[PDB]
Design an enzyme around this catalytic site. Structure first.
Site, mmCIF file in Angstrom:
data_model
loop_
_atom_site.group_PDB
_atom_site.id
_atom_site.type_symbol
_atom_site.label_atom_id
_atom_site.label_comp_id
_atom_site.label_asym_id
_atom_site.label_seq_id
_atom_site.Cartn_x
_atom_site.Cartn_y
_atom_site.Cartn_z
ATOM 1 C CB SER A 1 -1.006 -0.075 1.075
ATOM 2 O OG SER A 1 -1.892 -0.924 0.852
ATOM 3 C CE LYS B 1 -0.757 4.210 2.358
ATOM 4 N NZ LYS B 1 -0.767 2.950 3.290
ATOM 5 N N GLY C 1 3.335 -0.009 4.074
ATOM 6 C CA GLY C 1 2.779 -1.066 2.964
ATOM 7 C C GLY C 1 2.777 -2.274 3.626
#
Length: 256
Positions: free
Chosen positions: A42, A199, A201
């Protein structure tokens, strides 16, 4: 000797680790497997938001997107709540970054449009930023991969450079600053008086990534990209957040 520290982490966690920290005026680059490919998982959702911001006027954020049960992808902590009401583009950006919402990402990809349900648009956006390596597509296969160098240089441009005008830049930055998924990764390896935006993942094959911008207590920014997998252990290999935290700690030691 820093290379040896990262190699030690690979041995202890039984993992492949990738790091890249761009050089600045105050520091040398930090690089470890920086040009090997890792799954985005992600992490692609941060440049995805950037693409959507870049290719539209600010009014686009207010566009209401309606969707159905058939559009739900993965956990979707936010989008699961709004099947009946819809979500604006701006709400989708928020959810895609702060909650890694998979329905939101699906819809933002659709908003870009084009072949591959917006994946061609996404990849083309990265190409425009000078990334000739990364690809997002419709374990060792090159589909949906980036490199720590590639993503770190993208992130630098988006947050610290001039890829985005100031107003759009600030929106992306604020969403990353209020991320809810990253407390145990890069954030966990940096002292409390350092600022962190990020961010994440995560995937099967022990995949765990974090991309961040950090600010020293003096206000000096650095970009940190850490990527990992454990594909040797198959689909069910557990992702190791602590690996990323400890890699991050090594990085913080250099930047201190």
């Amino acid at each position: 000797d820093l290379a040896d520290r990262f190699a030690e982490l690979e041995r202890r966690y039984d993992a492949r680790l990738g790091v890249y920290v761009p050089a600045t005026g105050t520091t040398a680059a930090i690089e470890y497997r920086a040009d090997e490919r890792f799954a985005f998982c992600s992490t692609f959702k941060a440049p995805l938001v950037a693409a959507v911001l870049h290719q539209n006027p600010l009014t686009h954020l207010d566009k209401l997107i309606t969707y159905t049960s058939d559009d739900i992808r993965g956990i979707s902590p936010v989008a699961q709540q709004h099947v009946q009401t819809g979500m604006t583009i701006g709400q989708l950006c928020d959810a895609a970054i702060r909650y890694s919402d998979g329905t939101a990402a699906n819809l933002l990809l659709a908003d870009l449009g084009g072949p591959g349900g917006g994946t061609a648009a996404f990849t083309g956006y990265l190409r425009s930023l000078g990334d000739t390596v990364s690809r997002l597509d419709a374990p060792g296969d090159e589909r949906d991969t980036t490199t720590p160098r590639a993503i770190a240089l993208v992130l630098q441009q988006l947050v610290l450079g001039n890829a985005l005008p100031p107003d759009k830049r600030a929106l992306l930055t604020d969403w990353m600053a209020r991320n809810t998924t990253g407390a145990k990764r890069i954030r966990a390896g940096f002292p409390a008086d350092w600022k962190v935006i990020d961010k994440t993942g995560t995937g099967g094959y022990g995949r765990a990534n974090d991309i961040a911008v950090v600010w020293s207590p003096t206000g000096v920014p650095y970009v940190v990209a850490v990527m990992s997998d454990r594909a040797g252990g198959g689909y069910d290999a557990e992702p190791r957040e602590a690996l990323l935290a400890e890699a991050a700690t090594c990085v913080a030691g250099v930047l201190a």
